[PDB]
Design an enzyme around this catalytic site. Structure first.
Site, PDB file in Angstrom:
ATOM      1  N   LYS A  71      54.626  10.423  -7.810  1.00 50.57           N
ATOM      2  CA  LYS A  71      54.097   9.184  -8.355  1.00 50.57           C
ATOM      3  C   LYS A  71      53.342   9.499  -9.640  1.00 50.57           C
ATOM      4  O   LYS A  71      52.402  10.293  -9.644  1.00 50.57           O
ATOM      5  CB  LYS A  71      53.190   8.468  -7.353  1.00 50.57           C
ATOM      6  CG  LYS A  71      52.783   7.076  -7.815  1.00 50.57           C
ATOM      7  CD  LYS A  71      51.983   6.328  -6.762  1.00 50.57           C
ATOM      8  CE  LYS A  71      50.592   6.906  -6.600  1.00 50.57           C
ATOM      9  NZ  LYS A  71      49.776   6.102  -5.651  1.00 50.57           N
ATOM     10  N   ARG A 115      50.685   0.656   0.193  1.00 55.47           N
ATOM     11  CA  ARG A 115      50.547   1.811   1.077  1.00 55.47           C
ATOM     12  C   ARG A 115      49.074   2.099   1.342  1.00 55.47           C
ATOM     13  O   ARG A 115      48.704   2.551   2.421  1.00 55.47           O
ATOM     14  CB  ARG A 115      51.279   3.050   0.529  1.00 55.47           C
ATOM     15  CG  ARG A 115      50.792   3.593  -0.821  1.00 55.47           C
ATOM     16  CD  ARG A 115      49.649   4.595  -0.681  1.00 55.47           C
ATOM     17  NE  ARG A 115      49.593   5.536  -1.797  1.00 55.47           N
ATOM     18  CZ  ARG A 115      48.548   6.312  -2.073  1.00 55.47           C
ATOM     19  NH1 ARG A 115      47.455   6.253  -1.323  1.00 55.47           N
ATOM     20  NH2 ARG A 115      48.590   7.143  -3.104  1.00 55.47           N
ATOM     21  N   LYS A 235      25.653   9.136   0.648  1.00 54.10           N
ATOM     22  CA  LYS A 235      25.806  10.389   1.381  1.00 54.10           C
ATOM     23  C   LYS A 235      25.269  10.310   2.807  1.00 54.10           C
ATOM     24  O   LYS A 235      25.833  10.916   3.718  1.00 54.10           O
ATOM     25  CB  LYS A 235      25.125  11.534   0.627  1.00 54.10           C
ATOM     26  CG  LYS A 235      25.891  12.003  -0.598  1.00 54.10           C
ATOM     27  CD  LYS A 235      25.002  12.785  -1.548  1.00 54.10           C
ATOM     28  CE  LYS A 235      25.777  13.230  -2.779  1.00 54.10           C
ATOM     29  NZ  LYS A 235      24.874  13.660  -3.883  1.00 54.10           N
TER      30      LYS A 235
END
Ligand SMILES: NC(=O)C1=CN([C@@H]2O[C@H](COP(=O)(O)OP(=O)(O)OC[C@H]3O[C@@H](n4cnc5c(N)ncnc54)[C@H](O)[C@@H]3O)[C@@H](O)[C@H]2O)C=CC1
Ligand SMILES: NC(=O)C1=CN([C@@H]2O[C@H](COP(=O)(O)OP(=O)(O)OC[C@H]3O[C@@H](n4cnc5c(N)ncnc54)[C@H](O)[C@@H]3O)[C@@H](O)[C@H]2O)C=CC1
Ligand SMILES: N[C@@H](CN[C@@H](CCC(=O)O)C(=O)O)C(=O)O
Ligand SMILES: N[C@@H](CN[C@@H](CCC(=O)O)C(=O)O)C(=O)O
Ligand SMILES: [Cl-]
Ligand SMILES: [Cl-]
Lengths: 310, 310
Positions: A71, A115, A235
């Site tokens: 891709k 996708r 985080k």
């Protein structure tokens, strides 16, 4: 030597605008990933801003119906703003593993977005609560739109969708059009990210941000978050999450990699209190398997333009 | 959103089967390389044999006429042997740097072989003796054929061409057909590599070998060798050569990089006794500049098939 060319319209006609074909394709591909029957080099970034680049994503998938390809997807954050063009664009090339010759040239943006939405759907099957009713989307761009479309196609029990965009107008358009598409569902335009996220059993980040804003105590217990845009999550969430799932570890530089969830080698959600985080960098085998899937159906329905290589 | 498609036949019609357009394109590209006005990531190899792979070669070239793109070129050493197909194949995609959108899809094998021959021609202008008369080719495949064609087009003073192939029949075909194309030139089929190399003022290696055979005391004084196939040359030659030249250093992991020779920043051959070695790994900017050059002429002569992206 011929190549089938498939533009975005041809891809839709071949069934590339419904999530199910991508869910099917990824399911087999992610199974192949877990069994290590693939080759996937590190993807090189071509930069001449974070969303300003072109990425080469080559891969090979093994088996009797083995396929190779790449891709070649470009991006400019300015495209929708200053040019009224989609941010992402590009082509997918498929290759016959026997000769390595190219056999298909296909538009990539639609396949890429679909996708990616299929990644969220598949992860939700294992990591989201059964029959979850509240969905949250942050980022009302192209990706976010396909994320919402696919989740609605795959989860009929969804009742409310909480949406937020830093650009108020982008959120307003998004909500209004989708409210017309699905009237029985309440699409709620929130005034901040916190309100949207704290109301979601499934939260999907589809922005282009470079700094995290998602805080841990925003998330409901039992929530599942598909961190599509990667940079949205603080985080502390990675640390405080009960389970952290990625698509490919080595690619992301831990509960499981996504492929191990589909093979049952590692369990998914085990109670409705677990806060689960998915961090998918995106894999080339996802684009290539999806493309090869669509390409085959196009050949069956005689869809596409046949090109000569020589 | 449109893309111009250019197959091998279209590329030839646009002038892609003569060396001069590649010499012109590389000259400007190699100049840009020396001035560091380019972006060229490391090329990832996709292997599922040394000649069995597909290589992604992305790059960007700066300037007012800036261009981006990638060469997606596959290879199978078995292709000519068992399938009567060319070893190498693939496509070149061009991209508008402003939007990163694809604007061209082009066949790659011809362009690849011709730019590679142009690398040898350009290097010979700086590194080979003036008016050299003896040329040597090892490897009578596709690359070797284009190497010979380009050198003949660019150097009228060539009188003898010494050819060798490990496969005797490959050498016999090569010599016979070229003897008909250029009757006034003596094409000499040698019985070993040593005889061919020791008789060449310019030696070009175009094989698919994995082990060196070229020994230093084979080489004439004043000789120039374009090590196209890379693996043909013994380590001692790299050490004993008076000048070692590469196309891109960081890519090859020293006298000069090829780009510095064209800018005059570093001199080339300085006497007719110097044994000079060129070790070109091959650069993506060579394919992209050549493609963009040809693509522009095709647009001028209305050559090619216009595709819609969406
Ligand atoms: N993991 C994967 O495989 C994939 C990841 N991604 C990511 O998805 C994003 C692409 O989205 P697109 O719809 O295609 O582009 P887009 O530019 O059309 O969408 C961006 C939207 O998100 C909004 N937004 C931006 N920043 C924000 C913030 N800090 N907070 C809240 N809201 C915000 C923008 O206003 C804009 O409406 C990119 O970040 C891309 O890297 C894209 C494709 C697949
Ligand atoms: N530096 C660069 O930018 C480029 C480098 N190359 C290299 O050029 C070669 C491709 O050649 P093609 O004509 O396309 O493929 P090819 O397979 O058609 O040509 C191979 C020929 O060389 C002969 N040969 C092989 N091995 C040998 C040996 N040990 N000794 C003597 N003679 C020998 C073979 O019999 C065969 O006839 C590859 O090695 C490729 O990696 C290819 C393209 C550009
Ligand atoms: N997570 C990656 C995005 N990788 C995506 C690129 C797709 C696109 O740019 O539309 C992909 O997997 O194709 C990043 O943040 O750079
Ligand atoms: N020197 C490299 C070859 N790189 C070439 C590939 C072209 C081709 O395979 O025909 C290129 O630059 O395009 C190697 O030995 O792997
Ligand atoms: Cl860029
Ligand atoms: Cl291979």
């Amino acid at each position: 030597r011929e190549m089938l060319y498939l533009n975005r319209s041809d891809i839709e006609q071949a069934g590339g605008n419904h999530s199910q074909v991508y869910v099917d394709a990824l399911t087999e591909a992610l199974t192949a990933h877990a069994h290590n029957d693939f080759v996937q080099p590190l993807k090189p970034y071509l930069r001449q801003h974070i969303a300003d680049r072109i990425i080469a994503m080559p891969s090979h998938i093994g088996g009797e119906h083995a396929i190779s390809g790449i891709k070649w997807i470009g991006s400019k954050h300015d495209n929708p703003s200053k040019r009224n063009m989609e941010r992402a664009s590009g082509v997918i090339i498929l290759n016959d593993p026997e000769t390595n010759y190219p056999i298909a040239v296909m538009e990539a943006s639609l396949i890429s977005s679909m996708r990616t939405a299929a990644v969220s759907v598949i992860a939700a099957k294992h990591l989201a609560k059964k029959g979850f009713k509240d969905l949250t989307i942050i980022g009302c761009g192209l990706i976010g739109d396909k994320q919402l479309q696919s989740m609605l196609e795959q989860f009929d029990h969804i009742e409310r969708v909480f949406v937020y965009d830093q650009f108020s107008e982008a959120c307003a358009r998004f909500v209004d059009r989708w409210q017309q598409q699905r009237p029985e569902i309440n699409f709620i335009a929130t005034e901040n990210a916190k309100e949207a996220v704290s109301n979601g059993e499934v939260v999907i980040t589809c922005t282009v941000t470079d700094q995290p804003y998602i805080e841990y105590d925003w998330l409901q217990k039992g929530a599942f978050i598909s961190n599509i845009s990667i940079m949205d999550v603080h985080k502390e969430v990675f640390i405080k999450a009960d389970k952290v799932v990625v698509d490919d570890w080595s690619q992301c530089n831990l509960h499981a990699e996504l492929g191990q969830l589909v093979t049952g080698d590692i369990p998914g959600r085990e109670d409705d209190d677990e806060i689960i985080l998915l961090n998918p960098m995106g894999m080339a085998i996802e684009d290539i398997s999806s493309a090869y899937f669509i390409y085959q159906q196009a050949q069956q329905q005689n869809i596409g333009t046949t090109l000569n290589l020589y």
